[model samples]
Target: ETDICKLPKDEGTCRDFILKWYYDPNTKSCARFWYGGCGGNENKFGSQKECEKVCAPV
Candidate 1:
């Protein structure tokens, strides 16, 4: 039920060093992306480990 390139973000808080993760079907892993420090969704993570921990199984 997971969609490729379907990632999450957090638009509630704005930060300068916010890290993001997205599911990459090619590598089957959660890869790093940059946040604009403005708007996002609920799919944001503080670190790479946190992201993989929640998304690795997907």
Candidate 2:
């Protein structure tokens, strides 16, 4: 989780994106990443189960 208070100087674009997952508890399964900029696409998995399967080492 990001600290809202300690956000970057550009707080104007600091939109708090909440990702809720069903397979995993809360939004822990969701990974936060910046593709280009703050306005970049924020992808949310359909289910934590799917994320867990893909977000693991074989």
Candidate 3:
């Protein structure tokens, strides 16, 4: 089993590696939150700052 300390880091890495799930207020819908991983694909956003702009509110 993985240690707890390692789990935090692994989770962080996974979060970074995967496209975050987001909600776009402008579109009023769920969409991908990107992180410049795949050559600036339209599906990918430039920054977390950009992603947050469209993230769903609690």
Candidate 4:
């Protein structure tokens, strides 16, 4: 269920300049990422708290 933690960054094709957060397994934490505001994977979150809840526990 935590497989999303390993998901790679999905810099979506649109150029909408939307900011998002994603879990970087290598970094072992959530990091700020750029996105198009849509068409990305479930790994994307609106905030670090949400990202950590699905991928990390601390």
**Predicted model with the maximum TM-score:** 4
**Candidate 4's error at 5, in angstroms?**
1.8
Query: Which stretches in model 2 have alpha-carbon errors above 4 Å?
Result: 1-19, 22-43
lDDT by residue (1-58, candidate 3, tens digit) is 1121111111122223665433344564344443433333332334445544544343
What C-alpha lDDT values do all the predictions have? 0.59, 0.35, 0.36, 0.83
Q: Show how many residue pairs clash in every candidate, following the order shown.
A: 5, 0, 0, 0
Residue 30 alpha-carbon offset, candidate 2, angstroms: 4.9
Worst 10 residues of 2 by lDDT: 3-12
TM-score of each: 0.52, 0.27, 0.29, 0.82
Model 1 RMSD in angstroms: 4.3
- Compute the lDDT of residue 46 as modeled in candidate 4: 88
Candidate 3 stretches with Cα past 4 Å from truth are: 1-15, 35-58
Ranking by TM-score: 4, 1, 3, 2
Give, for candidate 4, the lowest lDDT window spanning 10 residues: 11-20
**Clash pairs (backbone) in predicted model 1:** 8-43, 9-41, 9-42, 9-43, 10-41
How accurate locally is residue 8 in candidate 2, as Cα lDDT from 0 to 100? 28
Residue 12 CA displacement from its true place in model 2, Å: 13
Sequence-dependent TM-score of model 2: 0.27
Model 3 residue 19 lDDT score: 59
Query: What shift in Å separates residue 50 of candidate 2 from its native position after superposition?
Result: 0.2
Task: Compute the lDDT for candidate 2.
Answer: 0.35
